[PDB]
Amino acid sequence: ARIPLDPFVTDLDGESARLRAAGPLAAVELPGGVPVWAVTHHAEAKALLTDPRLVKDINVWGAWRRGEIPADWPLIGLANPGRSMLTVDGAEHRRLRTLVAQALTVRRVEHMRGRITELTDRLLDELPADGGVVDLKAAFAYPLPMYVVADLMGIEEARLPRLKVLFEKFFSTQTPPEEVVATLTELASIMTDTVAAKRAAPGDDLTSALIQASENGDHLTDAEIVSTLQLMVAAGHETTISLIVNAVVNLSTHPEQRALVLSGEAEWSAVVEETLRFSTPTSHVLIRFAAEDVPVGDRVIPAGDALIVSYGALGRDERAHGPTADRFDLTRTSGNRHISFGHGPHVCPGAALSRMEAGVALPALYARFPHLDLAVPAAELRNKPVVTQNDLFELPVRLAHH
Numbered sequence: 001a002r003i004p005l006d007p008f009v010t011d012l013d014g015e016s017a018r019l020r021a022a023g024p025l026a027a028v029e030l031p032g033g034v035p036v037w038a039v040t041h042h043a044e045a046k047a048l049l050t051d052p053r054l055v056k057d058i059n060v061w062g063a064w065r066r067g068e069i070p071a072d073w074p075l076i077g078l079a080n081p082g083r084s085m086l087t088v089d090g091a092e093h094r095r096l097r098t099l100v101a102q103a104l105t106v107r108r109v110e111h112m113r114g115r116i117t118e119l120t121d122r123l124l125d126e127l128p129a130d131g132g133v134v135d136l137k138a139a140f141a142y143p144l145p146m147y148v149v150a151d152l153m154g155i156e157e158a159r160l161p162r163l164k165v166l167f168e169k170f171f172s173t174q175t176p177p178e179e180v181v182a183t184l185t186e187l188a189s190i191m192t193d194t195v196a197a198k199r200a201a202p203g204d205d206l207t208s209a210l211i212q213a214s215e216n217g218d219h220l221t222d223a224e225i226v227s228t229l230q231l232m233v234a235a236g237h238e239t240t241i242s243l244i245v246n247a248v249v250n251l252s253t254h255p256e257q258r259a260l261v262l263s264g265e266a267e268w269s270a271v272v273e274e275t276l277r278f279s280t281p282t283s284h285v286l287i288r289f290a291a292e293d294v295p296v297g298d299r300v301i302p303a304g305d306a307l308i309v310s311y312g313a314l315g316r317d318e319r320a321h322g323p324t325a326d327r328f329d330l331t332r333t334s335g336n337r338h339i340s341f342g343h344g345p346h347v348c349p350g351a352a353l354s355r356m357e358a359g360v361a362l363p364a365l366y367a368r369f370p371h372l373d374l375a376v377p378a379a380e381l382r383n384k385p386v387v388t389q390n391d392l393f394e395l396p397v398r399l400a401h402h
């Protein structure tokens with residue numbers, strides 16, 4: 001009855017359906033045969049996300065304290081990440097979130113609109129005009145979040161060419177494991193240089209702001225700042241890309257809704273929010289452990305067991321959005337907002353940033369290429385082999401009728 005999560009993501013929607021069916025708490029198996037629990041219903045997910053009994057501390061994981069976890073387990077990196085706001089809870093977590101929130105603010109994001117608009121137009125200018133097939137992901141969606149975050153972080157523009165090469169290697173599924181590790185260090189090198197540069201000469205960027213953040217004398221250490229910058233790249237690059245990609249796929253497959261937005265009858269923000277609910281870029285999130293036995297519906301998560309949050313599956317929970325939860329409809333009016341950015345203390349601090357990027361990129365893209373459409377059947381689109389993410393291999397499209 002256990003549900004094996006396909007690492008090659010050959011059937012995301014089918015898997016999500018099975019997960020909801022086996023919800024609220026579904027017994028699942030992670031790539032490599034590692035069993036864990038997964039909350040697959042909206043209501044139950046929010047409850048656990050705010051339950052102090054479910055912590056990030058990997059030490060609470062029974063199978064962990066033992067030898068049930070293969071040292072070569074591919075997903076070990078997501079299960080046991082480096083120190084950051086991601087690996088802690090309670091007071092330690094509140095400290096990091098409050099300090100970071102003084103830097104990555106709503107205001108800072110609003111003030112990035114102009115720059116995001118400029119980068120978007122620059123990337124659109126680079127798109128071919130021949131009328132042939134173009135991979136909108138590689139040529140538009142992928143590079144945007146990279147340049148935006150670099151600008152936000154205050155990374156020296158002369159380092160961009162190298163940053164691009166590093167990003168390519170770091171996120172490429174074909175990069176040798178050892179090379180990925182080496183690349184992460186060079187990225188850390190650029191981040192550290194940035195922190196050193198801003199300490200030497202403060203400016204109006206996110207790094208300078210992270211340096212200056214303070215709580216009655218308390219502040220972020222160089223290590224905490226660097227781990228935060230690294231986490232923002234790890235958590236916000238591919239997600240933002242997929243948000244843009246999935247939005248284009250959804251509009252392409254729902255003509256009447258695309259029309260509503262192009263005519264101005266529907267807002268672009270509705271495209272973004274429905275895309276986050278219906279096709280979130282983050283299908284599953286590792287990982288939490290029960291410090292004590294925790295009741296979930298008719299079942300119970302034994303103390304020491306693991307729990308992943310299946311945002312992809314619960315996004316279409318009919319108990320939260322009614323009968324039409326199984327389809328894309330940006331005109332819906334549910335009594336429950338989606339929780340694709342999480343819920344509770346660990347709620348995504350990049351929600352405003354991603355919404356701003358997609359909110360600028362999508363309108364600009366369609367204003368210039370109003371007739372853009374998929375160059376292949378939607379069914380022919382495929383996911384990248386990353387079990388926790390909903391990223392497409394590519395986005396073949398024809399910008400205009402050739």
Ligand code: HEM
Binds near residue numbers: 231235239281285339
């Ligand atoms: C629309 C694209 C995005 C989605 C769907 C998304 C989703 C999420 C979710 C679901 C979580 C929490 C997982 C859990 O606790 O169960 C999270 C955490 C996080 N996200 Fe995002 N995210 C997106 C973009 C970004 C961006 C652009 C950034 C960079 C500022 C970012 C930075 C983070 C960080 C730092 C955390 C850790 C929060 C913590 O553990 O305290 N995210 N995100």
